[PDB]
Design an enzyme around this catalytic site. Sequence first.
Site, short mmCIF file in Angstrom:
data_model
loop_
_atom_site.label_atom_id
_atom_site.label_comp_id
_atom_site.label_asym_id
_atom_site.label_seq_id
_atom_site.Cartn_x
_atom_site.Cartn_y
_atom_site.Cartn_z
N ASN A 1 0.81 -1.21 0.00
CA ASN A 1 0.00 0.00 0.00
C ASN A 1 0.84 1.27 0.00
OD1 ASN A 1 -1.39 -2.12 2.21
ND2 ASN A 1 -2.71 -1.49 0.50
N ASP B 1 -6.35 -3.96 -1.81
CA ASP B 1 -6.46 -2.60 -2.33
C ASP B 1 -5.05 -2.02 -2.44
OD1 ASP B 1 -7.49 -0.17 -3.20
OD2 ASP B 1 -7.75 0.59 -1.15
N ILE C 1 0.70 6.84 0.20
CA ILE C 1 0.11 5.87 1.12
C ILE C 1 -1.36 5.71 0.79
CG2 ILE C 1 -0.37 5.31 3.52
CD1 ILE C 1 2.00 7.41 4.11
N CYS C 2 -1.78 4.46 0.58
CA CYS C 2 -3.19 4.12 0.40
C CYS C 2 -3.74 3.73 1.76
CB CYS C 2 -3.35 3.00 -0.62
SG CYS C 2 -5.06 2.55 -0.98
N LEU C 3 -4.50 4.63 2.38
CA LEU C 3 -5.03 4.41 3.72
C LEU C 3 -6.33 5.20 3.87
CD1 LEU C 3 -4.56 2.94 6.39
CD2 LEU C 3 -3.23 4.91 7.17
#
Length: 432
Positions: free
Chosen positions: A176, A216, A183-185
Amino acid sequence: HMALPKDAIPSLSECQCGICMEILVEPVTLPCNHTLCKPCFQSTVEKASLCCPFCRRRVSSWTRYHTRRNSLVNVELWTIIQKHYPRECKLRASGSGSGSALKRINKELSDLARDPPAQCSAGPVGDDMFHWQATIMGPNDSPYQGGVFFLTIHFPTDYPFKPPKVAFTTRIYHPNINSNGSICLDILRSQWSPALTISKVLLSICSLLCDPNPDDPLVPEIARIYKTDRDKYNRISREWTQKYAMGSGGRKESYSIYVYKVLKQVHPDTGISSKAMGIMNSFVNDIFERIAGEASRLAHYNKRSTITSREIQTAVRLLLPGELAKHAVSEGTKAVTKYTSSAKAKTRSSRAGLQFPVGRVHRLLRKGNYSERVGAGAPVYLAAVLEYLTAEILELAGNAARDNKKTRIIPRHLQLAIRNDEELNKLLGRVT
Ligand SMILES: [Cl-]
Ligand SMILES: [Cl-]
Ligand SMILES: [Cl-]
Ligand SMILES: [Cl-]
Ligand SMILES: [Cl-]
Ligand SMILES: [Cl-]
Ligand SMILES: [Cl-]
Ligand SMILES: [Cl-]
Ligand SMILES: [Cl-]
Ligand SMILES: [Cl-]
Ligand SMILES: [Cl-]
Ligand SMILES: [Cl-]
Ligand SMILES: [Cl-]
Ligand SMILES: [Cl-]
Ligand SMILES: [Cl-]
Ligand SMILES: [Cl-]
Ligand code: NA
Ligand SMILES: [Zn+2]
Ligand SMILES: [Zn+2]
């Protein structure tokens, strides 16, 4: 008078205004049951949008009705807050631009100083309050353990109503997080709320390092490996942590975050290279092993089943040369004395007034099977000694970088500082 069950009395943090992050004063609870302090209600709702800042519901009619009757305040909640946090309320009593970004960011910075989270640190890079740097250590229950990861935080002008932009500066192997550090969060975009803080974002990032979300991903190849060859993922993650995040590779214990924190105390504007940090870690591990082994033998020879701060103190005298031993003994004693005379705190290090990890040192002393039992004072004393020696080395190493017209400590500056100091060369000359 409205009274609550003791178990249900809200904490101080639960009484904070989600907009300004100050304690709620004269709390205004909107018909959607979202609350904000009256100063924030006046600045962000009454004066302008006339909508709830949290759910965007319109409250113009409600505001018209209750402003005329002076019934905006939730008196039941206001009574509870005044009763249990009267001093925090008193500091806000004599006041009328609540909710502005600059004030909110400053309040979060002040809150961080009072309550740091999980060995994370964040603060302004220079004099621009909207640009921060953050430092997080790799969680122990993850393949990033022992690593020091640097991030940038960019606050928007309308913070807290829009999320902060957070990205990794240190390279990391994660499904991620991509090569740029994006950052994918959820907390950063879809699930952002004005009541969230940088502290909660960093804790959420640390939790992401522990448990990625491979369904994801930003890097599909890494998610595929995480999903089909976890051992390979862990291996590569560890390897990258050593290459880029000052990790140890997983073989030895890392103290890089604590070395860095000590470095910022003795030389705030001075950095340290990864190669030099690897040397600092070799010193700490060796000093730990020499003191712990000597203490092990002092307990055995003297028919004692426990390693206490007394065996640590004797071991320090036996192993360190005169002036270093005298100062180390004084620092360890001071830490054990402060620890014993202080209340149980968030961390044992904080109770002892130390940067180095008392709890971790205790775990290592027991894991090494140096003795059947390890007293609570031993790790306090030992951690204080390692911190003192680290500070004395970084002091001289930094002086060698200034003299060499450098702002970053490299192995040359460490080997120079140690060789030029008689006692340090006697203590660490063989390790090098
Ligand atoms: Cl109560
Ligand atoms: Cl009760
Ligand atoms: Cl009042
Ligand atoms: Cl309305
Ligand atoms: Cl009112
Ligand atoms: Cl109070
Ligand atoms: Cl691992
Ligand atoms: Cl990438
Ligand atoms: Cl980004
Ligand atoms: Cl990919
Ligand atoms: Cl002694
Ligand atoms: Cl602890
Ligand atoms: Cl631990
Ligand atoms: Cl333990
Ligand atoms: Cl462990
Ligand atoms: Cl002890
Ligand atoms: Na640690
Ligand atoms: Zn407020
Ligand atoms: Zn609402």
